[PDB]
Design a protein around this motif. Sequence first.
Motif, short mmCIF file in Angstrom:
data_model
loop_
_atom_site.label_atom_id
_atom_site.label_comp_id
_atom_site.label_asym_id
_atom_site.label_seq_id
_atom_site.Cartn_x
_atom_site.Cartn_y
_atom_site.Cartn_z
N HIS A 183 -18.91 20.29 -60.49
CA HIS A 183 -17.70 19.43 -60.49
C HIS A 183 -17.89 18.20 -59.36
CE1 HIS A 183 -16.42 23.41 -62.09
NE2 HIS A 183 -15.67 22.52 -62.81
N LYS A 184 -18.89 17.83 -59.40
CA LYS A 184 -19.00 16.37 -58.75
C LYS A 184 -20.11 15.83 -59.75
CE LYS A 184 -17.39 14.54 -56.02
NZ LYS A 184 -17.64 14.43 -54.81
N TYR A 185 -19.79 14.89 -60.68
CA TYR A 185 -20.78 14.43 -61.41
C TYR A 185 -21.47 12.98 -61.34
CZ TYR A 185 -17.60 16.90 -64.42
OH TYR A 185 -16.65 17.82 -64.93
N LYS A 186 -21.80 12.92 -59.88
CA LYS A 186 -22.39 11.65 -59.56
C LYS A 186 -24.12 11.87 -59.54
CE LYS A 186 -19.24 10.13 -56.06
NZ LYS A 186 -18.64 9.94 -54.69
N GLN A 187 -24.46 13.22 -59.44
CA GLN A 187 -25.78 13.40 -60.00
C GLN A 187 -25.73 13.24 -61.42
OE1 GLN A 187 -27.54 12.56 -57.12
NE2 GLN A 187 -29.00 14.05 -58.28
N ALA A 188 -24.83 13.60 -62.11
CA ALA A 188 -24.87 13.66 -63.64
C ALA A 188 -24.94 12.11 -64.29
CB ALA A 188 -23.56 14.39 -64.11
N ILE A 189 -24.40 11.19 -63.33
CA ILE A 189 -24.61 9.82 -63.92
C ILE A 189 -25.72 9.15 -63.16
CG2 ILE A 189 -22.90 9.05 -62.29
CD1 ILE A 189 -23.14 7.74 -65.45
N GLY A 190 -26.14 9.68 -62.00
CA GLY A 190 -27.32 9.39 -61.31
C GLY A 190 -28.85 9.60 -62.19
N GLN B 255 -44.47 19.87 -73.36
CA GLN B 255 -43.41 20.91 -73.61
C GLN B 255 -42.75 21.77 -72.56
OE1 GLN B 255 -42.81 19.64 -76.94
NE2 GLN B 255 -42.45 21.76 -77.32
N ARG B 256 -43.19 21.47 -71.39
CA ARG B 256 -42.46 21.83 -70.02
C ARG B 256 -41.71 20.89 -69.25
NH1 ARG B 256 -46.66 23.78 -72.71
NH2 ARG B 256 -48.09 23.14 -71.23
N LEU B 257 -41.45 19.93 -69.80
CA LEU B 257 -40.36 19.11 -69.10
C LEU B 257 -39.09 19.53 -69.31
CD1 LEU B 257 -42.92 16.66 -69.27
CD2 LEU B 257 -40.95 15.23 -69.07
N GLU B 258 -37.90 18.97 -69.07
CA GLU B 258 -36.58 18.74 -69.55
C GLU B 258 -35.71 20.24 -68.78
OE1 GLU B 258 -34.93 16.52 -70.70
OE2 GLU B 258 -32.90 17.47 -71.01
N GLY B 259 -36.48 21.31 -68.54
CA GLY B 259 -36.15 22.51 -67.85
C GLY B 259 -35.04 22.57 -66.76
N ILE B 260 -35.42 21.85 -65.61
CA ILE B 260 -34.45 21.88 -64.59
C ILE B 260 -33.60 20.51 -64.80
CG2 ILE B 260 -35.00 23.33 -62.76
CD1 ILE B 260 -35.81 19.66 -62.33
N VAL B 261 -34.09 19.69 -65.79
CA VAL B 261 -33.28 18.50 -65.96
C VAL B 261 -31.81 19.15 -66.50
CG1 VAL B 261 -33.01 16.45 -67.60
CG2 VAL B 261 -35.05 16.92 -66.71
N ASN B 262 -31.87 19.86 -67.66
CA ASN B 262 -30.61 20.48 -68.18
C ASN B 262 -30.23 21.65 -67.59
OD1 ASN B 262 -32.77 22.16 -69.54
ND2 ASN B 262 -32.09 21.52 -71.53
N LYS B 263 -31.02 22.21 -66.63
CA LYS B 263 -30.57 23.36 -65.99
C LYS B 263 -30.12 23.10 -64.45
CE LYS B 263 -33.83 26.68 -64.45
NZ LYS B 263 -33.53 26.52 -63.03
N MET B 264 -30.58 22.28 -63.73
CA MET B 264 -29.88 21.82 -62.47
C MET B 264 -29.16 20.73 -62.63
SD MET B 264 -30.42 22.40 -59.24
CE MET B 264 -31.91 23.15 -59.21
N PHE B 265 -29.09 20.19 -63.99
CA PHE B 265 -27.95 19.26 -64.36
C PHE B 265 -26.74 19.97 -64.47
CE2 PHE B 265 -25.91 16.67 -67.57
CZ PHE B 265 -25.94 15.44 -66.92
N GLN B 266 -26.74 21.29 -64.94
CA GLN B 266 -25.60 21.97 -65.22
C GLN B 266 -25.20 22.61 -63.75
OE1 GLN B 266 -23.79 22.62 -68.08
NE2 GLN B 266 -25.33 21.19 -69.15
N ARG B 267 -26.02 22.74 -63.00
CA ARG B 267 -25.68 22.88 -61.40
C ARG B 267 -24.89 21.80 -60.94
NH1 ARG B 267 -28.79 26.86 -58.54
NH2 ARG B 267 -29.42 28.51 -59.98
N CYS B 268 -25.29 20.45 -61.03
CA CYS B 268 -24.58 19.09 -60.91
C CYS B 268 -23.26 19.10 -61.48
CB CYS B 268 -25.59 17.95 -60.99
SG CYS B 268 -27.06 18.04 -60.01
N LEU B 269 -23.19 19.59 -62.93
CA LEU B 269 -22.06 19.56 -63.71
C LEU B 269 -20.96 20.30 -63.21
CD1 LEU B 269 -23.17 19.07 -67.53
CD2 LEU B 269 -22.17 17.16 -66.05
N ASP B 270 -21.16 21.82 -63.28
CA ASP B 270 -20.56 22.64 -63.05
C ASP B 270 -20.16 22.88 -61.59
OD1 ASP B 270 -20.34 23.25 -65.78
OD2 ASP B 270 -22.12 24.71 -65.89
#
Lengths: 38, 36, 152, 468, 254
Positions: C139-146, C122-137
């Motif tokens: 505006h380079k999606y190479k981590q977002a597909i990594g 219950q404490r996974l997925e945090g920086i997955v979808n939070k640093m994932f938004q850093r990678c998305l916003d």
Amino acid sequence: MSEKKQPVDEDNWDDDNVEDDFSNQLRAEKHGYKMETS
Amino acid sequence: YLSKIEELQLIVNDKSQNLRRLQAQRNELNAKVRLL
Amino acid sequence: GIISLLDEDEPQLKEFALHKLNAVVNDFWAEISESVDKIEVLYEDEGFRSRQFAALVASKVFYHLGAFEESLNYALGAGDLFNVNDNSEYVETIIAKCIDHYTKQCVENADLPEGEKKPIDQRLEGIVNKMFQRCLDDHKYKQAIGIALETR
Amino acid sequence: PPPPPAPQDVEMKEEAATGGGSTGEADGKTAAAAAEHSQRELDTVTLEDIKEHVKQLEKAVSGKEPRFVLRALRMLPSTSRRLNHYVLYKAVQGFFTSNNATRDFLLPFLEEPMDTEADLQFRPRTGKAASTPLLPEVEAYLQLLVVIFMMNSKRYKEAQKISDDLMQTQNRRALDLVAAKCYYYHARVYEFLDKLDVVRSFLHARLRTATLRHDADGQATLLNLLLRNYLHYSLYDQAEKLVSKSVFPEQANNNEWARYLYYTGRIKAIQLEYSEARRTMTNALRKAPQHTAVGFKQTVHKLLIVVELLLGEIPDRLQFRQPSLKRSLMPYFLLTQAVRTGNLAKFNQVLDQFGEKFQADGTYTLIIRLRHNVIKTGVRMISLSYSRISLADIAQKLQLDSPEDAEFIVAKAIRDGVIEASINHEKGYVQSKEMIDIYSTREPQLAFHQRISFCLDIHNMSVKAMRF
Amino acid sequence: MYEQLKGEWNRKSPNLSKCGEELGRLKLVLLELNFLPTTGTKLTKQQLILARDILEIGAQWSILRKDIPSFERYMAQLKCYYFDYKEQLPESAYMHQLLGLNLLFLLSQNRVAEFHTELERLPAKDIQTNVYIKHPVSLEQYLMEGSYNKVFLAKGNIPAESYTFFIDILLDTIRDEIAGCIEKAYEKILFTEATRILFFNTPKKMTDYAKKRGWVLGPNNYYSFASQQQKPTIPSTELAKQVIEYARQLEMIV
């Protein structure tokens, strides 16, 4: 090398270690006087 | 940084590949002495 | 000797011990290594409502001693203030090993057909979808597909 | 003005190798460590520690540090013309008038190789620019207008910690190699005045940052710093080594590991140990690197074999004795003589004669057990001597005056386990034996597994050393 | 400021839980004050000098109530009181024997290196003075010199503000070390060597020894067993397995 804190600081010489080992035994008569003790 | 450090160090471990280069030298010597 | 001052069996002196921990824990890195057992006592106690901080200094002292899978266990046990940190040694090496466990877990469960998995603790997925938004916003999606590589 | 050309030559020979050559050995090199100019530069730092460094006096004042710290630029291939600038500025010392521009004007001189241009990307040039000027400033600690400047120069080296920690690449196999030296000089200059307090947390976090990402010569050297820190002051955090024993690198510098085992031998000597402490003292003793450094093994060896003195099975130690150490071992020679003698009045009269040098040692652990060592020397000698001795013979041969404390001596010697010796219990009167026909055939070949398994370990180590 | 902290100052024990009222008051001291993060300005540490005083008197309460977790608790408090970085304190009253309490407790619980970190933390006040320390350290020299009778020579005078419990534990570490060291490798003892090395001529406690350690109470006589060593025949095949992995490790290598 000495890269530490420490930078702060046979005539008889051969027989000398034994001499200090001889420094506890009758250094050099009571040996011979023991003859007449009995 | 996060997931980009270990395989660079793995290619660094190709010093073991250099060990294979050394054993390659070795088996060269041996094969050619046997050719002799 | 900071753990013998805990005979008061409430968390209200465990909190003064933790107020000593977050003051001088790096000096007293020698001290907590024996106290691993009572940190376990704090984690096991659900009435100890600061068990988040128990798992915090647990992962701290295990990051000191070189335990890493139990650093993962009590890193998940650390809570919601765990992933959000921006620090440059502690949190990023242990979320490195944590999302390394996430990708090797998604490989093993991608090697595991149709369920029967190890569930999301219950404490996974945090920086997955939070640093994932850093990678998305950013505006380079190479981590977002990594991540899409790394999850299979 | 004819001698300062020798620092003019060795200065350019140093940063030629360091700057240009180890920058080219940093660009793309270091498969394990192809920065051989790093070890070349540590050789030249030992060379500047043999000689005067560059400009302490050198018949003038302050010539090279205002000069060469300018204009590196790392650009288009006519930067050997900036090297030509470096070379042909040398008419100032011989021909022109020298002027004082060190230890005061250095504060923008360190910012000159950053404010010329975007010179280059790597940190060993920055560590060069803050080390190769400022290490020629540290060994003049006359505490007047020179030590506050060592202090601020190593505050710039704390900025070098900052630019070691946030520099964008394994340049730690140059900067930790220089930083071992300069962090020892940190601890030196910090503790020429007072004990260091938050420099302890500096050292803690500096050990923390060198954990796994770049674990090369930093952990062991900063741990030597931390160990001698906890050694010079009160002794509370040796339990940290007892709980966090992570002390095993490649043992790279081959003398760092030797003196490291020496320092932790002093640790286990002061915790409590005979056996393991004397064997790591022995391993550091035979792991003395050379005698190419005059009389530096000597005081540290006086404090090394304190535990062998505490064995009681030591003869006079004279094969180590430097004749310049003789006037300082005027206590210590008579102390090992008091080890060879069983006199009690001399056992306390050596103390009454040399308690100040015993405080210069500062180890009470020796005298808190050295009387017990005298009685154990007696029991080892006489219990190896006779099969069925009496406790009265040895007792009133060593002035014990009663049977029952001789009984407690023999009992605590059985408890300490040297010989079988029991008591023909009516009023004492020991009935005992020696021990020959103990065993001699299957028992050697028990240890011969360790003999030849140790040999085959060193076989495979020579194989993995033949790999190089 | 804050008068009622001194509510248990000079009578030392009417109860156990009125010292618990003082414990709640020191609990409020831990709420408001917290001695360790307090950096400087040494008038916010004068009530902490008072805390040093009444927690030395609380260590006296810890030996008064026999509580060893509270003993090590308040002793670790005193250890931290010499540890916070404002070392320039008024000279502590019970300083000489708090070290002695800790040292004699250590001597009772049979430690091996905390004795020497005690010999390292304050060495210079051990030989010149401080009978609360000077007497236990040469007493330890006499204990591992070979005299359990210097115990009673010393007990001629060692109350030393309630070292009485600790010298009772010292009598206990006499007697269970007799339980070890009564026939380690002896022939045999009799009633009189029990009377010399042991004391209190015959309770049910040396009888309890003879009926508790697996002991043969011989005819006014003693033996560890009928053979004393439990009689100490194949050294071959285990070293043959050693030869297996030994030849194996000599294999795979050249």
